[PDB]
C-alpha cells in the first residue's frame, strides 16, 4: 500500500519498454500512415479540396506563406505542378458527376501524398465535424419530436428511418403503416420536412449523401485513432527519457511530479513535430522540447 505517487507512476509506466531507433522509425511510419489516411478521406470532401485550392490562391496572391500552408511530402514550383494536377482531376471529376467515383478515388490518390500545416488540418477537421454535428442535430431533433409527441415506437424508428433522413419516403411509409402514432405524426409533418429540407440543402452543398459522408468521416476517425495510438506508444516509450532529464531541476522551487508532467507535455509536443526523414535519434529532438517546457514552467513560478 505505497502512498508515494512517484512510486506508482514508476510502477504503471515501468511496464512499457524502450525500443531501438528502427522502432521509432516504424512508429513515425504509423503516424504518417494515419495522417495519410485521414487526408485521403478529406480528399473526398469537395469543400475541403476547394478550400485548399483557395489557400493556394492566397499563396500565389501572397496571402499565405510557404511555411504556413505546406509541410513537405513523402520549393513552391512542385506545389504548383501538384495543385494544377489536383485541380484538373477535380474538374474532370465534376464534369461527369459511376465513373465519377473512380475520379474521386484518383483524386484521393493524388492528394494523398500531400502534407499541410496543422492549422489547416484543424480547419478541415472543424468543417467535417460541423457537417457531422448538423446531421446529428437533425437526428436528435426529429427523434425528440416523434418519440415525445407521437409515441411512435423506437423499433420502427431504428429500423426504417436511418440512413435516408432526407426523402419523404420514410414519412410516407410510416404513415401507410397505419398506427395511431402515424396519425399523430401528421401534426409534425411540417417541421420535420422543413428540417430535412435544410439537410438536403447541406447535402447539395457537399454534393454527397448521408451514407457517403458517414463512410468518409468514419475512415477519418479510424485514421485519427491509429495516429493517436502511435503517439501513445511513442510517449510511453519516452517517459523514461523525461524522468531522466527531469532530475536536473528538483530544488528549483517546484515539485518533482509537476516537473515531469511539464516535461511530458513538452515531449508530446515533440512527437507532434517529429519526422523520421531527418535521420536522427529521437532523444536529440525530445531533449530540446522537454527542456523548453520544464524551464518555462519553472520561470513562470518566479
Amino acid at each position: 500500500r505505497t502512498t508515494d505517487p512517484v512510486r506508482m507512476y514508476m510502477r504503471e509506466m515501468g511496464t512499457v519498454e524502450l525500443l531501438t531507433r528502427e522502432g521509432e522509425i516504424e512508429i513515425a511510419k504509423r503516424i504518417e500512415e494515419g495522417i495519410r489516411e485521414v487526408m485521403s478521406a478529406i480528399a473526398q470532401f469537395p469543400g475541403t479540396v476547394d478550400s485548399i485550392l483557395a489557400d493556394y490562391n492566397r499563396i500565389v496572391a501572397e496571402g499565405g506563406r510557404l511555411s504556413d500552408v505546406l509541410s513537405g511530402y513523402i520549393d513552391p514550383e512542385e506545389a504548383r505542378l501538384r495543385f494544377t494536377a489536383v485541380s484538373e482531376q477535380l474538374d474532370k471529376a465534376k464534369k461527369a458527376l459511376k465513373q465519377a467515383t473512380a475520379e474521386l478515388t484518383g483524386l484521393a490518390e493524388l492528394f494523398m501524398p500531400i502534407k499541410l500545416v496543422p492549422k489547416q488540418f484543424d480547419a478541415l477537421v472543424a468543417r467535417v465535424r460541423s457537417a457531422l454535428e448538423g446531421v446529428r442535430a437533425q437526428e436528435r431533433a426529429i427523434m425528440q419530436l416523434c418519440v415525445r409527441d407521437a409515441r411512435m415506437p423506437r423499433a420502427d424508428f431504428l429500423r426504417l428511418f436511418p440512413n435516408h433522413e432526407t426523402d419523404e419516403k420514410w414519412v410516407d411509409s410510416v404513415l401507410k403503416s397505419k398506427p395511431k402514432y402515424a396519425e399523430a405524426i401528421e401534426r409534425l409533418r411540417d417541421d420535420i420536412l422543413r428540417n430535412q429540407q435544410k439537410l438536403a440543402a447541406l447535402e447539395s452543398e457537399v454534393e454527397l449523401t448521408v451514407a457517403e459522408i458517414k463512410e468518409i468521416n468514419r475512415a477519418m476517425s479510424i485514421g485519427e485513432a491509429k495516429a493517436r495510438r502511435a503517439k501513445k506508444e511513442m510517449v510511453e516509450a519516452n517517459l523514461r527519457l523525461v524522468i531522466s532529464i527531469a532530475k536536473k531541476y528538483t530544488n528549483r522551487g517546484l515539485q518533482f511530479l509537476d516537473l515531469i508532467q511539464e516535461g511530458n507535455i513538452g515531449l508530446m509536443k515533440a512527437v507532434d513535430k517529429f519526422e523520421y526523414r531527418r535521420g536522427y535519434k529521437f532523444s536529440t529532438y525530445a531533449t530540446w522540447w522537454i527542456r523548453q517546457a520544464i524551464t518555462r514552467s519553472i520561470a513562470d513560478q518566479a
Binding site: 500500500r1 502512498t3 508515494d4 505517487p5 506508482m8 507512476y9 504503471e12 509506466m13 493517436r228 503517439k231 501513445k232 510517449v235 510511453e236 530544488n251 522551487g253 517546484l254 515539485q255 511530479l257 509537476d258 508532467q261 511539464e262 511530458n264 507535455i265 508530446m268 513562470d300
Partner: protein, 1338 residues
C-alpha cells in the same frame, strides 16, 4: 442576533453560492504593475477592491455609489473590508475525495460504502477498477478489478458493466447510495446476526445512515467537485521590507492546486494517453489533499526548507495544538507588565503602579478628563501635555486612578486567585509594587517574577473587579475554606518572635493596667519584648449572637503577646493570642476571625498583623550566622559507632558468611537508624539550647537560636532541611533509585567532600528534572479538568432529591486521617440526623453545616452522616445550590451562576506541581464492634470468618468508631463485642500465610479421589515437619491423574451425607494443587476447620489515571453476581467459576486466564461487590456492580490519598463535581424508544422516559446502565461541537459534526467565549435569562 451554529457538508451548489467568482489563474500579482491579475488569487473581480471605495481603473472614485459596478470596471466599487468575506471557487476537471472524510480513523466514506479504506485508496490511487451498476452480470458493485482482471471482464461481457477509476468512481458510487433502501436493509439485517462485533459494525452503519437521512446531508457531497478559496486577507502575502513578498502556505497550496487543475483540463482537451491522464488526476487529488491537510498520507513539503507546509487543518487547529490561541487567548489592549516588588506600606486592597505604566494605560481616561476640565481643547494639545508630563497631568492621573481598580496576574494562573483586582496607587519607578500577603495566593516570590496589569473599562467591569475579584474579597482559598491571604515567612517570624517567653528577662514580674501601659513600658525600654508579666485587659466576647459582652480580666502573659493583642479585633478572646503564634496558629486565628467578626475587620486585622510582623521582625535583629547551625556533639560518637559496625559487617561479608544482598539491606537499615538518631539528638540539643539564670539557679528554656525559630515558627524551613544543615545528610539515591550503600556524613556547615557532593548532585538533578515534567503534566491535567467540567454551573436552588453520600471519618489504619468535622463542614445534610438513640432529630433537613453545627455534632456522638453531593442532585443541565454546599471562597452558600465546575477543576489542578499483616493490633482502648461480618461461632468460640467482606472496629465510649481494621478470611477472633479491650491487644489472631478453606459443616469427611501419585502425594517434610499429604499438580500427574481432582465428600461422624444450606449439593470442596489438608480423612473436623491451604502508583500519573478511568496492565478481578462460587477449570487454561445464587441461579460466568494468580476459594459466597483476585481496581467494574456512590467514595478517597501525601488540603466537593461531569453519560440496554446500545446523556434518557410515562404506552420507558468516561473522553463527547473542537482532535470531531449535521446551541462557557458573548455564569446569567425569556416565550 443568532444562535445554533450549524455544521454540514458543503454542496457544490452552495459552494457556488458562497463564491463571488471562478479563480482560474495561478499567479497572483504582475511583477511590472502591482495590481492583482484577472482570475488570480487576489483578483478584484472576485474578492473585492484593493482600496476602499475604488475600482481598477479609477473610472468611479466618488464615495456615493457603494454597490454599483462600473462598465469598464466590472470590479464593483465597495469598502476594502469586503476582501475578508468574499470567497471564490475552483472548477475541477475531475472530482477529488475530501481528505478529512477519508483519513479519519473511522473513514466516513469507507463506512458509507461498506468497503475498507484500503480498497477505496486502491481505487483513488488509480490502482484498481471498481464496478458501478452491475446489472445482469457476475460482477458486483463492491468488486475491485485489476488491469488484467478488468480487461478479461470487458472481453467476456462487453457491456452492462460500468467500471471506473479514481475519485470519479467514488463519486458515482456515492450518489447512487439510496440511503432509504440501505437503511431499511441494514435495519432488517441488524438483529439477524448475534455476533457482538458484527452487530456493533452494523449499528455504526445505522448511526451514519440515519444521521445522513435526518441531517439533510447528501452522501455525494463528500467528494467535492468544486472547492473554495480563502479570502485574500486571511491568506495574505506580507511583503518583506526591501520589496520582497512573504507568501503564506495557503497561497502556495492554492497555486499548486490551480496549476494542476489547469494542467488537467489542457491535457484532457487534447486527448493525452490514459496513463498520463490518470497520473495527473492522482496529482490533483494529492494537491487538494495537501491543501486541506498534511502529513496524513503524503506529508507534502515546501521549497528549500524541511519544514512542512501549513494547511487549513493546521490553521484552524491553532497554535499550542488544538487550544485555539486566537479565539481563546486573544491578546488584549490596555495592558502592560513589569517586574514585581514587595510594598510593605500598602493596604491589602491597593497595589503600586509606576507613573509611566499608569500614564500609558489610562491614556484615554486622561484625555477624557482633560477635555472635560477644559485644560485641553484639541487632542493634540492633550497628547502634548501627557507626553510633556506637565505638573497638572499628575493631578488628573490621580483622579482617574482614585477608584479605578486594575487586574494583576502572574504568568501561570493555576486558579482564579492568580488574578485579582487592586486599587492602584502611583509610585516612583518602573516596577509594580505588590502587597506581601497576596504573594502566597499568586505563588509569586520577588526573585524576578513579572506581572501583567489590565485596566477594566466598563462600569460593569470596574464593579466586577471591586465586588468579586478585589483582593479583600478573596481571602479564603476556593479550594478549601482555610485562608490564603495569611502572614508569610517574614511577618510570621516577627509575630512568633514577639509572642515568645524568656525565663528571666528585663521587665519580668510587674503588672500593667492596660495594653497601653505595656506599650508605654516597652517603647520606653523598661521591659523586654518577651517577659512574663501580668496585665489586665478589656476583651469583648461574641459568645451570644447580637450581644457583644465585654469583660475585664487579669492574665499572666508576656509583653509581646499583650502588644499583639492590641491588634486583634473586638470579637475574639485574649486566649487566642496567648500562645507562641506559629504560622499554623496565625492562619487558624485569621480563619476564626473571619467566621466570627466579618470581612472588613478581617482585612484590617490582616493588614495590622502584617504591619506588626514586619515592625517586630525589624526590631529583632534576627540573623543567620555560622554559629547558628549547632552541630550535636554526639554526632561524632554515633558516626564512629556506625562506621565500626559497617566495617565489621564488611569484614563478615568478606568472610563469606553474609550475602551481599542481605548486607546491603542491613547496612542501609543501620545507616538510616544512625541518621535518625543523629537528627533526633541535633533537634533535642538545638530546641533546648538555652541556659538562663533566674535570680540565682540556672534553668533551661526554649531556644532563641535563629534557625530554630525559623523552623519552629513555620516561617521558613523544615526539620528535613535542618537535618542537612546541622546534621548528617543521610542516605541518597542513585539515578536508578537504589540507595547508595554509603551515606553523606558531613553537613552543609562542615561542607561535603567531592564524592558526597557528586551524590547530592545525583539527587538534586533528579529532583530538578522531575520538576519541569511535573509542571507540564499539571498544566495538561488542569486543562483537561477545566475542559471537562465547564458546563457545570449552579442553576437551581433545591433540586428536591434526598440521595447523597454517607460521609464518615477517614480511619484507614490505626489513626483517624480526617475527622468527620472537616469532611462535612460547609456541606448540607441529606436526611435526618439522630442521637445515639433514634427517634430524636438532631439535624432536621438540608441545613448548611457551619462552625456552630460542626461543633454541635462534635459535642454529640454523631459518627456517620449523609450529605447532599454533586454526584446527586439529578437536576438537568447544572447543579442545585444545596447539593453543592457552602462556597469555599465565601462564608455563605453558593449563589446561582457560580461556575463551580471551573473552580473545581482549578482547585484540583493547581497543586499538581506539588506532586511528583498477619494479626490485628489495636492501637488504643475501645469497645470492639463488628461490621459486615458473616461467620458462625467455632466449637471453642474462635469465630473464624471466611467471608471476604468484613472489618473489625473498636468503637469509643461515646459510640463513634475510633479505629477500623480489615478482617481477612479465616480469622480467629476473641469476640468481645461490648467488652473493652486494652490498647495493644491482639483480639483477632488471623495468620493466613496461605489461602485457608474453612469447613462450615462437621463430621467424618470422605476424601474421595485422593490418589497417592495421581491426585495427592503423601510427601512428608524433614524432621516430621508435616504429617500431611501434598496434592499432585494437574500437569505433574499422570495421563489419567490429570483429570482426577481430590474431593472431600461431606459425611457425618457416622456416615450421613451433609450439605450446605441453600444448595442441595454437599459442600464437598475439591482439593487443588499445592494444598495442605492436615486433618485425616474420616476424622471429625470441627466447624470452621481449615481444610485446604494454598500459599499466595503515586503522584500526578496516579491522579491522571483515576481521572481518566483507565485500566492497568493487570486489573483486579471482581465477582460478577453474588451467590455460590465454584472452582475454575484450569485444564482449559482459563478458570471458569460458575455462580449459583440462592435467590436465582445465573449460570453465566466468564473465564479468567491463569496467567495471573487467582486467590479465589470455591464453595463460599460470591459477594459480587467483593474481589476475586488481587490487583488495583478498574474504576468501571466498581461502577457497574457496586453502584455510583461506592465509585464516588472510592475515587474520592484514592485522589485524596495522593493529595494528602504531600499535605495539600482540597475539599471533596471539587472531586465529586468532576466525577459528576464524568458520570454524565449512560448507556441503554433495552431501549424501546432508542437504539439498542448508545452513549446518550442521562438527561436525554431521563427526559425521554418521563415523556414516555405520560405518553403512548407504559412500557416505552427505557432501562439503562450508568457508564464512566475519562475526562479526555467525556469532554470530547459533549453535545456541543464547538466546545470539543477547541479542546483536542479538532479534525475528528469536526468531521463527525459535518456528517452528523450537528447544531451547537451556545449554552456553555467556551461557546460564548469563542463567539464573544456573555458568560452563561456569573453576572451574564441575567442577560442569558432575559434572552431565553424573549426567545423561548415568542
Amino acid at each position: 442576533e443568532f444562535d445554533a451554529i450549524r455544521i454540514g457538508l458543503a454542496s457544490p451548489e452552495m459552494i457556488r453560492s458562497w463564491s463571488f467568482g471562478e479563480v482560474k489563474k495561478p499567479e497572483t500579482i504582475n511583477y511590472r504593475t502591482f495590481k492583482p491579475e484577472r482570475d488570480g488569487l487576489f483578483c478584484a473581480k472576485i474578492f473585492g477592491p484593493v482600496k476602499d471605495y475604488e475600482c481598477l481603473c479609477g473610472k468611479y472614485k466618488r464615495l456615493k455609489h457603494r454597490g454599483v459596478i462600473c462598465e469598464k470596471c466590472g470590479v464593483e466599487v465597495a469598502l476594502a473590508k469586503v476582501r475578508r468575506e468574499r470567497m471564490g471557487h475552483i472548477e475541477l476537471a475531475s472530482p477529488v475525495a475530501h481528505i478529512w472524510f477519508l483519513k479519519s480513523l473511522p473513514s466516513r466514506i469507507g463506512l458509507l460504502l461498506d468497503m475498507t479504506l484500503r480498497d477505496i485508496e486502491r481505487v483513488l490511487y488509480f490502482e484498481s477498477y471498481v464496478v458501478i451498476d452491475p446489472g445482469m452480470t457476475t460482477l458486483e458493485k463492491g468488486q475491485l478489478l485489476n488491469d488484467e482482471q478488468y480487461f478479461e471482464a470487458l472481453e467476456e461481457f462487453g457491456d452492462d458493466f460500468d467500471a471506473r477509476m479514481g475519485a470519479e468512481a467514488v463519486h458515482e458510487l456515492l450518489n447512487a447510495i439510496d440511503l432509504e433502501h440501505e437503511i431499511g436493509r441494514l435495519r432488517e439485517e441488524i438483529p439477524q446476526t448475534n455476533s457482538e462485533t458484527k452487530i456493533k459494525k452494523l449499528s455504526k452503519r445505522l448511526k451514519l445512515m440515519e444521521a445522513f437521512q435526518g441531517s439533510g446531508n447528501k452522501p455525494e457531497w463528500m467528494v467535492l467537485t468544486v472547492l473554495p478559496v480563502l479570502p485574500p486577507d486571511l491568506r495574505p502575502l506580507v511583503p518583506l521590507d526591501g520589496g520582497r513578498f512573504a507568501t503564506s502556505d495557503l497561497n502556495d497550496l492554492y497555486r499548486r492546486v490551480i496549476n494542476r487543475n489547469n494542467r488537467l483540463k489542457r491535457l484532457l482537451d487534447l486527448a493525452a494517453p490514459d496513463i498520463i491522464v490518470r497520473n495527473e488526476k492522482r496529482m490533483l487529488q494529492e494537491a487538494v489533499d495537501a491543501l486541506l491537510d498534511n502529513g496524513r498520507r503524503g506529508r507534502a513539503i515546501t521549497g528549500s526548507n524541511k519544514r512542512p507546509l501549513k494547511s487549513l487543518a493546521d490553521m484552524i487547529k491553532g497554535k499550542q495544538g488544538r487550544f485555539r490561541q486566537n479565539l481563546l487567548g486573544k491578546r488584549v489592549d490596555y495592558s502592560g507588565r513589569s517586574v514585581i516588588t514587595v510594598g510593605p506600606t500598602l493596604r491589602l486592597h491597593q497595589c503600586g503602579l509606576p507613573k509611566k505604566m499608569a500614564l500609558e494605560l489610562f491614556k484615554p481616561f486622561i484625555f477624557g478628563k482633560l477635555e472635560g476640565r477644559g485644560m485641553a481643547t484639541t487632542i493634540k494639545a492633550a497628547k502634548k501635555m501627557v507626553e510633556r508630563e506637565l505638573p497638572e497631568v499628575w493631578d488628573v492621573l490621580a483622579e482617574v486612578i482614585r477608584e479605578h481598580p486594575v487586574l494583576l496576574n502572574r504568568a501561570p494562573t493555576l486558579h482564579r486567585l492568580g488574578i485579582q483586582a487592586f486599587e492602584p496607587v502611583l509610585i516612583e519607578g518602573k516596577a509594580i509594587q505588590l502587597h506581601p500577603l497576596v504573594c502566597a495566593a499568586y505563588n509569586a516570590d520577588f526573585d524576578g517574577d513579572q506581572m501583567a496589569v489590565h485596566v477594566p473599562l466598563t462600569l460593569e467591569a470596574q464593579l466586577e473587579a471591586r465586588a468579586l475579584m478585589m483582593s479583600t474579597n478573596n481571602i479564603l482559598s476556593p479550594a478549601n475554606g482555610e485562608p490564603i491571604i495569611v502572614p508569610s515567612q517574614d511577618v510570621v517570624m516577627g509575630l512568633y518572635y514577639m509572642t515568645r517567653e524568656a525565663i528571666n528577662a528585663k521587665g519580668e514580674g510587674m503588672a500593667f493596667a492596660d495594653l497601653q501601659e505595656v506599650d508605654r513600658a516597652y517603647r520606653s525600654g523598661q521591659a523586654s519584648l518577651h517577659a512574663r508579666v501580668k496585665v489586665r485587659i478589656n476583651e469583648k466576647i461574641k459568645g451570644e449572637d447580637g450581644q457583644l459582652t465585654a469583660n475585664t480580666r487579669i492574665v499572666d502573659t508576656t509583653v509581646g503577646r499583650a502588644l499583639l493583642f492590641q491588634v486583634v479585633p473586638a470579637g475574639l478572646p485574649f486566649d487566642v493570642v496567648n500562645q507562641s503564634m506559629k504560622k499554623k496558629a496565625i492562619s487558624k486565628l485569621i480563619n476564626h476571625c473571619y467566621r466570627v467578626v466579618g470581612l472588613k475587620d478581617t482585612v484590617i486585622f490582616a493588614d495590622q498583623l502584617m504591619y506588626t510582623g514586619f515592625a517586630y521582625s525589624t526590631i529583632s535583629g534576627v540573623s543567620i550566622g555560622v554559629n547558628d547551625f549547632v552541630i550535636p556533639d554526639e554526632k561524632a560518637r554515633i558516626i564512629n559507632a556506625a562506621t565500626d559496625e559497617v566495617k565489621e559487617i564488611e569484614s563478615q561479608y568478606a568472610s563469606g558468611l553474609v550475602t551481599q544482598g542481605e548486607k546491603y539491606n542491613k547496612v542501609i537499615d543501620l545507616w538510616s537508624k544512625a541518621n535518625d538518631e543523629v537528627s533526633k539528638a541535633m533537634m533535642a540539643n538545638l530546641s533546648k539550647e538555652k541556659v538562663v539564670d533566674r535570680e540565682g539557679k540556672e534553668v533551661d528554656q526554649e531556644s532563641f537560636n535563629s534557625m530554630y525559630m525559623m523552623a519552629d515558627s513555620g516561617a521558613r524551613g523544615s526539620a528535613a532541611q535542618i537535618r542537612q544543615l546541622a546534621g548528617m545528610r543521610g542516605l541518597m539515591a542513585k539515578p536508578d533509585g537504589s540507595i547508595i550503600e554509603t551515606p553523606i556524613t558531613a553537613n552543609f556547615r562542615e561542607g561535603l567532600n567531592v564524592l558526597q557532593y557528586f551524590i547530592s548532585t545525583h539527587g538534586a538533578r533528579k529532583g530538578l528534572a522531575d520538576t519541569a515534567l511535573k509542571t507540564a503534566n499539571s498544566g495538561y491535567l488542569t486543562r483537561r479538568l477545566v475542559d471537562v467540567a465547564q458546563d457545570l454551573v449552579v442553576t437551581e436552588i433545591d433540586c428536591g432529591t434526598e440521595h447523597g453520600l454517607l460521609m464518615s471519618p477517614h480511619i484507614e489504619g490505626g489513626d483517624v486521617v480526617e475527622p468527620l468535622g472537616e469532611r462535612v463542614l460547609g456541606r448540607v445534610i441529606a436526611r435526618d440526623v439522630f442521637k445515639p438513640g433514634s427517634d430524636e432529630v438532631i439535624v432536621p433537613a438540608g441545613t448548611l453545616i457551619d462552625e456552630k453545627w460542626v461543633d454541635f455534632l462534635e459535642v454529640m456522638s454523631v459518627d456517620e452522616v449523609v450529605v447532599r453531593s454533586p454526584i446527586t442532585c439529578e437536576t438537568r443541565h447544572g447543579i442545585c445550590a444545596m447539593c453543592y454546599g457552602r462556597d469555599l471562597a465565601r462564608g455563605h452558600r453558593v449563589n446561582i451562576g457560580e461556575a463551580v465546575g471551573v473552580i473545581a477543576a482549578q482547585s484540583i489542578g493547581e497543586p499538581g506541581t506539588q506532586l511528583t499483616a498477619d494479626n490485628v493490633q489495636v492501637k488504643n482502648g475501645g469497645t470492639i464492634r463488628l461490621h459486615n461480618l458473616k461467620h458462625v461461632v467455632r466449637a471453642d468460640g474462635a469465630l473464624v470468618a471466611v467471608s471476604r467482606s468484613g472489618e473489625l472496629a473498636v468503637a469509643d465510649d461515646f459510640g463513634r468508631e475510633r479505629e477500623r481494621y480489615k478482617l481477612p478470611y479465616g480469622a480467629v477472633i476473641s469476640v468481645k463485642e461490648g467488652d473493652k479491650v486494652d490498647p495493644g491487644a491482639i483480639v483477632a489472631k488471623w495468620d493466613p500465610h496461605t489461602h485457608p478453606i474453612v469447613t462450615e459443616v462437621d463430621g467424618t469427611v470422605a476424601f474421595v479421589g485422593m490418589e497417592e501419585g495421581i491426585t495427592v502425594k503423601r510427601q512428608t517434610d524433614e524432621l516430621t515437619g508435616l504429617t500431611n499429604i501434598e496434592v499432585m499438580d494437574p500437569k505433574d500427574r499422570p495421563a489419567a491423574g490429570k483429570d482426577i481432582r481430590p474431593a472431600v465428600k461431606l459425611i457425618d461422624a457416622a456416615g450421613k451425607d451433609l450439605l450446605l444450606p441453600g444448595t442441595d449439593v454437599p459442600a464437598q470442596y475439591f482439593l487443588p494443587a499445592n494444598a495442605l489438608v492436615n486433618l485425616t480423612d474420616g476424622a471429625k473436623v470441627s466447624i470452621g476447620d481449615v481444610v485446604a491451604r494454598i500459599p499466595q502508583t503515586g503522584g500526578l500519573p496516579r491522579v491522571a489515571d483515576l481521572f481518566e478511568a483507565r485500566r492497568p496492565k493487570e486489573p483486579s478481578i471482581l465477582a460478577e453476581i453474588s451467590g455460590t462460587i465454584s472452582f475454575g477449570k484450569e485444564t482449559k487454561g482459563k478458570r471458569r467459576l460458575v455462580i449459583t445464587p440462592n435467590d436465582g441461579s445465573d449460570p453465566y460466568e466468564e473465564l479468567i486466564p491463569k496467567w495471573r494468580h487467582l486467590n479465589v476459594f470455591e464453595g463460599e459466597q460470591v459477594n459480587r461487590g467483593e474481589v476475586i483476585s488481587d490487583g488495583p481496581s478498574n474504576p468501571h467494574d466498581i461502577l457497574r456492580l457496586l453502584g455510583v456512590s461506592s465509585l464516588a467514595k472510592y475515587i474520592v478517597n484514592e485522589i485524596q490519598d495522593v493529595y494528602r501525601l504531600q499535605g495539600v488540603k482540597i475539599n471533596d466537593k471539587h472531586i465529586e463535581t468532576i466525577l459528576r461531569q464524568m458520570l454524565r453519560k449512560v448507556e441503554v440496554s433495552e431501549s424501546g424508544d432508542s437504539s439498542f446500545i448508545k452513549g446518550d446523556q442521562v438527561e436525554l434518557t431521563q427526559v425521554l422516559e418521563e415523556n414516555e410515562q405520560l405518553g403512548t404506552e407504559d412500557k416505552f420507558p427505557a432501562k439503562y446502565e450508568r457508564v464512566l468516561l475519562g475526562i479526555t473522553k467525556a469532554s470530547l463527547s459533549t453535545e456541543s461541537f464547538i466546545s470539543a473542537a477547541s479542546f483536542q482532535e479538532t479534525t475528528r470531531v469536526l468531521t463527525e459534526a459535518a456528517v452528523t449535521g450537528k447544531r451547537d446551541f451556545l449554552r456553555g462557557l467556551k461557546e460564548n467565549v469563542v463567539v464573544g458573548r456573555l458568560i452563561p455564569a456569573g453576572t451574564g446569567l441575567a442577560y442569558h435569562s432575559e434572552r431565553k425569556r424573549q426567545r423561548d416565550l415568542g
